[PDB]
Enzyme design. Sequence first.
Site: not given
Ligand SMILES: C[C@@H](CN)Oc1cccc(CN2CCC3(CC2)C(NC2CCCCC2)=NC(=O)N3c2cccc(F)c2)c1
Length: 371
Positions: A36, A221
């Site tokens: 990540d 990202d």
């Molecule tokens: C691989 C992806 C597939 N959906 O699943 C995941 C699961 C966990 C973590 C991540 C990495 N990662 C974690 C953070 C992320 C993106 C994915 C996020 N990032 C934002 C932060 C502010 C600036 C713009 C970007 N906002 C969310 O709600 N996210 C999220 C998305 C899905 C689930 C979650 F818990 C958080 C990704």
Amino acid sequence: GSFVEMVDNLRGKSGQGYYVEMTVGSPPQTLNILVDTGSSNFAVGAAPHPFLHRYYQRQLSSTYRDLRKGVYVPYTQGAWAGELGTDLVSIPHGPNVTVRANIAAITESDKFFINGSNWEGILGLAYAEIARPDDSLEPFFDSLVKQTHVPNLFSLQLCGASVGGSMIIGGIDHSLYTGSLWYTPIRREWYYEVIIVRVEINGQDLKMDCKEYNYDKSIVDSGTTNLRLPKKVFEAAVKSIKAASSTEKFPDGFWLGEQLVCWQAGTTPWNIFPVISLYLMGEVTNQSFRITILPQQYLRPVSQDDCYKFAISQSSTGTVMGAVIMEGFYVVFDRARKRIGFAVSACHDEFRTAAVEGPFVTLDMEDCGYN
Ligand SMILES: C[C@@H](CN)Oc1cccc(CN2CCC3(CC2)C(NC2CCCCC2)=NC(=O)N3c2cccc(F)c2)c1
């Protein structure tokens, strides 16, 4: 091929992220960890969970040191809570080193882990500024560079559709790309922030003020599936993509990711959809370059039918160049020189290919950044 043992060290499931094996503690406990570049914490599932095949058992690690401080990481789509500590960490298919790193032991979570993803933790590769609880919790990559002679750089080759790829730590592997590597500056060391200076749909300029493309930031990202665009940009991009793909009409919900469209196996008319070009600020005054993505990248696969989801979505927190963008390219996170490199990936159809082209003359690129 000096980096050969790091090639093909990533695995994943379509739209479920890419993961690397990491070995923690003593005796060794190997887990699958989400790569990540959009976060800065190293954190692992540390208690049983229905979506986890395995988890970190701190009591079995003699080298585990409890920091006696909790950590909570909330996001829009999910969150996790855990305990801070440090332990010995190695990447068996990564650099030949072992470091003592900060590790968050995840004890509870909400909509964080994914059923069937095969990963049990996350490797936040971004900078200390966005680490939780605060910027004093040294991220994994910072510990790696401070404790070893591994050069301050990593590169990612994410191969699209089960998926695979490579994370090269400490260098660049020339077998992973074709043509030249083009660099864009890292504007600020928090997320991997970059500056988009122009957007085209099938060579047609979107003609928006370039400040809108980077409002309030544009980041690279690997942990985000989609290409995420600020609302105003998303609306203009969808309007342009719809106009360029008018040989077939789709329901409004398809463009909003609410509806899927399926085609008989091997009949997807890729040729009807446009290519998308993002121009990035270059390393020399008034010079830019462009990365061009195909519909094979922005239409992601979800029997006799191939189902697809439109993987460009709206954002209220800036542009996110997720796995949609990264899959067409070999991406170099050159932390040492504060820049991000793009080249055509060694991992398309007979009529079109993803491309990295330049140079282009683009004036007043500094005015594209948000302050
Ligand atoms: C691989 C992806 C597939 N959906 O699943 C995941 C699961 C966990 C973590 C991540 C990495 N990662 C974690 C953070 C992320 C993106 C994915 C996020 N990032 C934002 C932060 C502010 C600036 C713009 C970007 N906002 C969310 O709600 N996210 C999220 C998305 C899905 C689930 C979650 F818990 C958080 C990704």
